[PDB]
Amino acid sequence: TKEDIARKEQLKSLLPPLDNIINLYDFEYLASQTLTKQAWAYYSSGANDEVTHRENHNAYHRIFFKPKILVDVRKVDISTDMLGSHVDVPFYVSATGLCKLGNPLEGEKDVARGCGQGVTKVPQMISTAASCSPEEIIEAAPSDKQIQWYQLYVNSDRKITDDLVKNVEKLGVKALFVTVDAPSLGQREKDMKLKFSSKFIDPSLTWKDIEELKKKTKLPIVIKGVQRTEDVIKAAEIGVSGVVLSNHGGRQLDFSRAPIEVLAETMPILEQRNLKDKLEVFVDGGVRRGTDVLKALCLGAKGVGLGRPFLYANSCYGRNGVEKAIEILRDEIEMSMRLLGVTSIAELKPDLLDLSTLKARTVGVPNDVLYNEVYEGPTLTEFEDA
Amino acid sequence: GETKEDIARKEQLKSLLPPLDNIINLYDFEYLASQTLTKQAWAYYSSGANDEVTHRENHNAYHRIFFKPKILVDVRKVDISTDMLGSHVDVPFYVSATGLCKLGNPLEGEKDVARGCGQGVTKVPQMISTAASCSPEEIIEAAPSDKQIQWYQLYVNSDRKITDDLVKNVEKLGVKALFVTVDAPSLGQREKDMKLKFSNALSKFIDPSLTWKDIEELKKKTKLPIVIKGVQRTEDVIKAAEIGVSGVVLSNHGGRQLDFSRAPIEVLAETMPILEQRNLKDKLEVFVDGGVRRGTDVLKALCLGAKGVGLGRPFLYANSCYGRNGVEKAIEILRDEIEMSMRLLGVTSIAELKPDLLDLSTLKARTVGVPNDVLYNEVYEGPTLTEFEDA
């Protein structure tokens, strides 16, 4: 609408220096003002009323910390293992389709770059729906040490999916995340409203098919989009490597629970049956601060994913932005680890958390409109007129 | 009390209404109606009893329920048809009785909802109000389809002969059930309505004497299935089963009667397990209404074991902005919302919607916060986001 005049003025040199970016929300704010209406709609959107998208995040605040004091914390290590690889941090960039809307010149290529160009090396989940080719993305990663996973929507045409699995294996991805929370497309209304002037994805995907995909590949399988303890147990029973507790960033079923709350529930069940070492359990949704990450890890998550935050960093400052987002988050984790009073990821245990109010998921009774309207609050002292 | 704001409202209405294809959800209809209906029409449709808490609560209580969706289930094909009161129904929801539909649709009123409910590929049951602005005969005649279900809403008169003639007439006109409304012996005080009359409660028409005996007698006078509409507690659900009526609507009249009646979704959750405990499982069909605006709302109620879920206001609004095709669009929006969240839920039929698909652990978290600390919050300044360069 010939208004992106204003839009290139902000982008251009009105953007703050990267070094002035304090947190992940800063990236989000700037993204909100500079992207095209449709890039913004496509990235920021959730399903229907977007309660789950929001509740993904808010549920972290239903958990508090019980930190240890008087512990030597001079030295902290936040490295860990995810899917047989050693990783610098306990988080990753979750898979995120069509990055070219926000970063038109480089797209998914810049995520790879930002994930390996600096001191800390963060795993990248690549979308089957990436606007770049899997080859353009792997051959762009500036360090052999960095790792890459492939996210898979299994096609109705299973020949397509059988060759895809084979092409990514030989390109060096270290795992397959099979997305199972999107048999039909979540109704994302922000998109639709602006639009006013599936085959891609097989809705028949079965457990039996996952049993089958186990046999046709040597890459480790994580079932991405589990939303129930019962199905975590089912992933164990069929012997996949892992599972992402996820609701697609609240882009699919609205009133899916927060994965953090589901985590809290499933981990203890997985212990009453030996299964803690069997199944790596990942978590995404709503994660915006180092303490969110820490809460997850304390509950038993092997790793925690982020989508939108990185997507927004990438869309404003490309690869450099991604590297900074990594820096911001990695420091948030170390700094708060220290205040928690532990020194390694393996020391992050449930006794560090206060879980007594996890289930305080409330809906107030409607506000008394008349009563509140006529009431006049207390008032501060004023300053003389002089 | 309308100005020549009849004009501001008319240009609004007049071609400024967006194309029907651009309506995404049931709220849109609501929004459009709020700007285009006459002040009296808007007040009559949109209002509730006293402080309107029950009205809003009806809706919010749905949000105290979350889902436990099944993954990696074959959800290629999905069917949302079911049965209600002995008839096959394309859909698990229906249009509840609303009086005076001509305030919003002056030309056609209830006839246009009959048309919307029955014209297209998806057909929806319609409950006809005793306070309908059109006649029963007009509304039944108007029905474009033989396979479409019309039900009749009854207010029993103090003069029982009138009620007797009425029941005989609608049975003969071919309605398929009687919903006897029991939650309005006294008329709920809808203050938005009163606020117009100035600056702009017992009646013989609805008999405040209606009793359990009266319902018992009524069922010997007709072969139509009888439903008690306006049940607000489990004790009365059990009572309904005892007198052997067909069903019950857990309802509070859309928050238009008693304020601080519970959300029907909450009563449902309490009631159905107690109806297993006592065997009465499928002796009584249990319907729920009020505050339903999304397919996931409908799904939650069915998972608790509602036979069907009714909507009032959303259909009023569609009819008032877009007549018959508005009603069909409303039917399509909701139909699609239900099918699509069934797939994501991991079930393929109505019978497969069961309590184990719901997380019910925070159902009871209906809270009133301690008043906030206005001075503390006033002086407090929150974090801010980075700004763009000054220039």
Next chain:
Amino acid sequence: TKEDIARKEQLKSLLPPLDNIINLYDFEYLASQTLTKQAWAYYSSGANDEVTHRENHNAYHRIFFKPKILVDVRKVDISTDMLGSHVDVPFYVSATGLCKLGNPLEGEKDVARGCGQGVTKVPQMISTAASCSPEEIIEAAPSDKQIQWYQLYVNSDRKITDDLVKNVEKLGVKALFVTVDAPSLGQREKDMKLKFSSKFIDPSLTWKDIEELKKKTKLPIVIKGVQRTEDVIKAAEIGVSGVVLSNHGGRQLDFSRAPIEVLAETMPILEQRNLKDKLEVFVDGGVRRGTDVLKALCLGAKGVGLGRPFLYANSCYGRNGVEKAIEILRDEIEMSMRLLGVTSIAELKPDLLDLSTLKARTVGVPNDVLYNEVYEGPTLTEFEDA
């Protein structure tokens, strides 16, 4: 501040016709705009941060109704007995000092008039701190049938209080409410802020003194301002007639509980010890609708008081306003009784109430300012530009 120009313009003929007053809040609104800054401050005020004042009301919303349908409700009776007198309604006007601030010409006289001038006769509690004399108030009541109670602050000079008790007995008051929640004055900051350009009340009042006051008078004693089950039991043990569960309209101790919540707690204790008939138990605070009254009565209150609502009616439309406030409330009760499915005050029992969430008295965790600020809600469909 020569602004009460505006003030007499509203008062004068800008005031809506009495017949256009729908509810008790309407009176409150109009009062808010027309009273002097200091009358408003003096009436509307609560203690410190005014949480209790507000929580008095909000706690009613922590209770829902379980109403009976298919009950013949053609006929309802809301009459009852309070302190050996038959009363038309199950409520009363609580005592309220200095009514001349709002109604300068008539004051406490107009409350009496409004309480007996129309069809329904409501009891009046008279303040020891009334701006009118007890004689001017009793001799103004236009029906002998109407009843009057006296509220007593016992003076440090007990001669003053001994003659006062004697003067009100012979003037025909049918009871004494001894106020015990105000040994020191609650800090009411709205007053203080505007003011910037005790002996009256004995802080040594003891149980022993109430035992003593029992002997020196034949009028029935209600201890007004009980805030604990433990002290209700103490009023029983010393054989007073009644007790008002009250915190002075949140004008005294902030973070006193809502009397409704205290009611809910004490009534069942009074049954596990025979005491339900022994002690009449009254309740005030926050009551603004017929359903508030009904909730109280269902829990076992013998009556429910209101202050501010009547005070505001009286201050805008004097005696006529008071009569209308009575009408508004009395109809609210009958109408909702009917919808509840009972026909007499004695049928108002706890089984009519849903008490499962009485203790859902919550404080949210602080709002996530950044997260919420950047989030953009869903949006309604717009209307064409045309």
Next chain:
Amino acid sequence: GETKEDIARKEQLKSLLPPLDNIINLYDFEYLASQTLTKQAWAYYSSGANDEVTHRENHNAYHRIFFKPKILVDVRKVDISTDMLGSHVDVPFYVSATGLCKLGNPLEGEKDVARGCGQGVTKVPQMISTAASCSPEEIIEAAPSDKQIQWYQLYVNSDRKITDDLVKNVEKLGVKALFVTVDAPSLGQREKDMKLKFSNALSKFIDPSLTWKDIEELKKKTKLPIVIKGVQRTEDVIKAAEIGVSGVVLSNHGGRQLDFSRAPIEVLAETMPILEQRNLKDKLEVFVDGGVRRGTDVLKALCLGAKGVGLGRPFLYANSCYGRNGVEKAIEILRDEIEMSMRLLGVTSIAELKPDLLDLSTLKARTVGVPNDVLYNEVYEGPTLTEFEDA
């Protein structure tokens, strides 16, 4: 990053500040400071770690506690004096350590709080910060009264000789206890502060290695009572008692360090009963700080068994607007708030403040609402009040 808004702030400050007698509560000081301090001073004082939730929570958690006041008790005379760490104290509260008090009071800084704490009829303990802008000697010299209590806040340096000299110096200067701060091995990220630096974390100074052994050693090196400041869980309270230190401050540094540390009032409630269960009753004096702004806040903490309650920010604000007499006014406001609500509580001394005066049943109701339904709430129109006549 100050404009010649140094001027807008100076006319504000300059005689436009209201008379001290017109200040009603601790919030007023806060308000006045927010308009008169330099941007850096305001950010440094008012800010917390990351999203600042713990900071606000410190305060709100007090509101999860209600009172069970005793009636018809003789409350003519009331006494709020008590003892802390072996000294008699006029009051149950104290001024916690805040660094850099010269940002707000350029001329006098910490010396003016020393004066405010000790000048008048009511005297209040002062904890001196290691990051004080004035010197210990300056601040102690400044104390107008022999009977006034000064305590010292210690950050142990990586170079322990510096800490050793410091402890010997302040002991000799006559401070009455050591508060060793343990909740800041890493510096909390206070983003309001950072937001100025642009567009306008380990240090050798605070040793991140500090250990339980180090505290044990410290107590053999001084006769002063030692308090561990920044205890955030009961497990560490038990640990403090085991090594036989004098006391513990349940504190999270005013929400300036770990975000999502609990409200200390909540930890208090959990901790004290466990300190009966194990006998350790009065082996350890337990202090609480953070979010305290009213006398009833102080009362709640004492009823749970705190020995004393500390305040940071409110005293900073009084000192920054009004220097020494601001501090005294703050002391008087709070002193009066405590005495007056003791009477209404129905007790007459500190020892009489016990758990049975509190309603603790909703202490755990720390909730996060499900996000609200923006579309539902948007279209919804509430009831309105009557209007005055058009004319």
